[PDB]
Design a protein around this ligand. Structure first.
Ligand SMILES: *[C@@H]1O[C@H](CO)[C@@H](O[C@@H]2O[C@H](CO)[C@@H](O[C@@H]3O[C@H](CO[C@H]4O[C@H](CO)[C@@H](O)[C@H](O[C@H]5O[C@H](CO)[C@@H](O)[C@H](O)[C@@H]5O)[C@@H]4O)[C@@H](O)[C@H](O[C@H]4O[C@H](CO)[C@@H](O)[C@H](O)[C@@H]4O[C@H]4O[C@H](CO)[C@@H](O)[C@H](O)[C@@H]4O[C@H]4O[C@H](CO)[C@@H](O)[C@H](O)[C@@H]4O)[C@@H]3O)[C@H](O)[C@H]2NC(C)=O)[C@H](O)[C@H]1NC(C)=O
Ligand SMILES: *[C@@H]1O[C@H](CO)[C@@H](O[C@@H]2O[C@H](CO)[C@@H](O[C@@H]3O[C@H](CO[C@H]4O[C@H](CO[C@H]5O[C@H](CO)[C@@H](O)[C@H](O)[C@@H]5O)[C@@H](O)[C@H](O[C@H]5O[C@H](CO)[C@@H](O)[C@H](O)[C@@H]5O)[C@@H]4O)[C@@H](O)[C@H](O[C@H]4O[C@H](CO)[C@@H](O)[C@H](O)[C@@H]4O[C@H]4O[C@H](CO)[C@@H](O)[C@H](O)[C@@H]4O)[C@@H]3O)[C@H](O)[C@H]2NC(C)=O)[C@H](O)[C@H]1NC(C)=O
Lengths: 59, 204, 48
């Protein structure tokens, strides 16, 4: 299982930051775990961003 | 979540770092080496993951959660964060605990305070820099004062870094207006290391 | 209201509604099919 991040390392202010993760060794279809992001500002603590999953329920 | 800023120990000794604000059992701890990615060393409190030594143990008592590392070694030197689920599905992380297994010996910090220059005031800018170095452990808090009352504005402090002599060093940057610099005679810089504090003062 | 013999308690009583009643029945278990092979040619579907 390997997670490879990809996208622009340099973005201008007020613009739209876009990033894409490429998973290897596992399926995003799997309902065992959620997939999302966690960003760590330079010399600072860990902050939760968000996660989602297509594995749904009846509603 | 409240995690202690620093933690130290000798090789073979056992360290227990705490965390508070956890009302649930979803508490988990992480290990992040400097210049590397964080790794989960524990989950669901005490439970251990694959390829993780027995000496790492999670514990939670009341509203307080605790991690315990016995038999310290070089590779245990890193920043340790704790995290847990809260409410419905949101999750938060603590400030993290920095544990260092660096070599001896302990030492008091050293402060050198420099007032703004003559050329700098010409740019209509005033900046004072406190240089703190040669201290153990590698976590130190810095405070600023003007004449008497403390200064809460313009404070920029960064995480210390190890030097060639293995002693940590840090620098705090205070940026203000030249008006408040000439008005207030002396500016004090307080540096707190393991309870004891070291102060410096400069006046034009 | 319909009944074969009304005063008789041994006979069931059939009722016909005016307005339909909304009813929901769900299977709040999200399942998978094993489709195990007990051949030759036959395959049984187990509950995963
Ligand atoms: C219960 O548990 C179940 C698991 O046990 C779980 O099932 C999982 O559900 C998710 C969500 O639907 C599935 O992900 C989907 O994957 C689709 C492709 O699936 C194939 O490939 C997979 C990878 O190999 C296989 O795993 C998969 O096998 C499954 O199905 C088999 C039968 O076909 C079955 O035998 C297997 O056992 C297994 O169950 C299959 O071979 C993928 O196409 C799909 O994406 C669309 O659907 C999502 C919603 O379902 C949308 O959110 C998503 O955005 C996609 O919609 C867009 O694309 C479609 C075409 O790709 C269009 O038709 C749509 O209209 C839509 O397009 C519009 O929108 C776009 C933007 O969104 C836009 O760009 C377009 O232009 C257009 O405007 C989905 O990701 C997963 O595969 C399921 N299985 C597993 C094992 O995880 C289930 O969800 C749980 N809950 C319930 C209630 O059942
Ligand atoms: C559909 O379902 C309904 C109900 O859900 C079914 O209805 C049931 O039908 C049966 C018939 O098969 C009834 O049983 C029959 O009852 C009659 C009448 O009995 C009542 O009245 C008697 C007289 O009442 C008058 O007189 C007094 C005195 O002056 C006055 O005060 C009154 O106000 C009246 O004016 C009375 O004697 C009865 O009381 C006795 O019986 C009851 C019930 O058992 C007891 O509680 C009492 O304590 C008391 O003992 C009653 O109040 C009876 O006359 C029928 O008896 C015949 O059949 C018997 C077999 O069951 C048999 O042994 C008897 O000998 C008698 O047969 C006689 O009559 C025949 C006809 O003339 C002759 O051919 C025969 O040779 C013989 O001479 C019988 O008991 C049920 O009561 C009734 N259900 C209810 C709840 O009332 C219906 O059958 C179902 N149908 C279908 C198709 O599904």
């Amino acid at each position: 299982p390997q997670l490879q991040e990809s996208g622009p390392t340099l973005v201008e202010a007020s613009e739209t930051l876009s990033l894409t993760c490429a998973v290897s060794g596992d399926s995003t279809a799997a309902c065992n775990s959620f997939w999302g992001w966690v960003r760590q500002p330079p010399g600072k603590g860990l902050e939760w961003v968000g996660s989602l999953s297509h594995c749904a329920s009846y509603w | 979540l409240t995690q202690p800023p620093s933690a130290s120990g000798s090789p073979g000794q056992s360290i227990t770092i705490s965390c508070t604000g956890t009302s649930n059992n979803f508490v988990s701890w992480y290990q992040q080496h400097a210049g590397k990615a964080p790794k989960l060393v524990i989950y669901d409190v005490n439970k251990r993951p694959s390829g993780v030594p027995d000496r790492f143990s999670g514990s939670k008592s009341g509203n307080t959660a605790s991690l315990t590392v016995s038999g310290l070694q070089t590779d245990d030197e890193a920043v340790y964060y704790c995290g847990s689920l809260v409410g419905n599905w949101d999750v938060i992380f603590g400030g993290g605990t920095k544990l260092t297994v660096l070599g001896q010996p302990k030492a008091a910090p050293s402060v050198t305070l420099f007032p703004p220059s003559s050329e700098e005031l010409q740019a209509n800018k005033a900046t004072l820099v406190c240089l703190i170095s040669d201290f153990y452990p590698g976590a130190v808090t810095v405070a600023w004062k003007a004449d008497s009352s403390p200064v809460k504005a313009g404070v920029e402090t960064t995480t210390p870094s190890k030097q060639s002599n293995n002693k940590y060093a840090a620098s705090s940057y205070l940026s203000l207006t030249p008006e408040q610099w000439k008005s207030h005679r002396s500016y004090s810089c307080q540096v707190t290391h393991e309870g004891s504090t070291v102060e410096k003062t400069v006046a034009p | 209201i319909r009944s074969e013999n009304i005063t008789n308690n041994a006979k069931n009583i059939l009722v016909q509604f005016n307005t339909p009643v909304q009813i929901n029945c769900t299977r709040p278990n999200n399942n998978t099919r094993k489709s195990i092979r007990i051949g030759p040619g036959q395959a049984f579907y187990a509950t995963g």
